[PDB]
Ligand binder design. Structure first.
Ligand SMILES: [Co+2]
Lengths: 138, 134
């Protein structure tokens, strides 16, 4: 029996406030945990989007047994969309916010994706489940 | 808001060692593979994307897809029904002689296990009780 799902996705942002506002507003994500200058954790359906300041998640506290991590550079992750329409709605919401649409892509099977950057430069995508054969929610 | 997260990306220099790991240790189904470039696995309704950071960053060719690539140790977590499932994987890591970096009991009585994939990424397996997911 392999794992049934991915519960947490980690991204790193040196400016946590700019990242906290980006996801809170652009995507309306619920914020669950927040420790100033350290991290901001959002919930998305049954998954968690974890944003860490790479410098702190990297720091070794003697009483914190939690394994350390931290990456440098531009990350990537994709939000799920139910169809081209949801993808289109998101693309429009980005235009309405002055957020550049780095890319809009139609895949061989005819599915779509939209691409943007969060304040840290991470590649944030929105794609319909069709990209990987995930039947619509139902 | 988006109803879910579909893709999670990790980086690794040695893709074959990374593929072996996620395929044999976790039994994830491979969906896409481009030699020396990337390997994508399916996990439930999600996708774990493995990239060679150098190959994702490199200036195009005419790859319209945005560039990315991070160097360092990343992190992500697999979902587990309860403690029994967290424990099964813990036992499985030991059977595979993979060192268990950390076994943790959270304040609400939730459990997680931590190990490292070949690239150094912090790979976790925690129960949904952790964030209140029924
Ligand atoms: Co993509």
């Amino acid at each position: 029996k392999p794992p049934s799902a991915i519960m947490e996705t980690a991204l790193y942002a040196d400016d946590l406030d700019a990242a906290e506002a980006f996801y809170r507003d652009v995507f309306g994500l619920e914020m669950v945990l927040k420790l100033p200058g350290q991290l901001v954790f959002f919930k998305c359906g049954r998954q968690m989007l974890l944003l860490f300041d790479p410098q702190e998640s990297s720091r070794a506290d003697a009483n914190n047994p939690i394994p350390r991590h931290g990456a440098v550079g531009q990350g990537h992750f994709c939000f799920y969309a139910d169809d081209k329409a949801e993808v289109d709605e998101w693309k429009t919401r980005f235009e309405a916010l002055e957020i550049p649409v780095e890319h809009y892509h139609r895949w061989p099977n005819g599915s779509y994706s939209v691409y943007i950057r969060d304040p840290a430069g991470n590649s944030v995508e929105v794609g319909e489940g069709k990209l990987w054969g995930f039947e619509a929610e139902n």
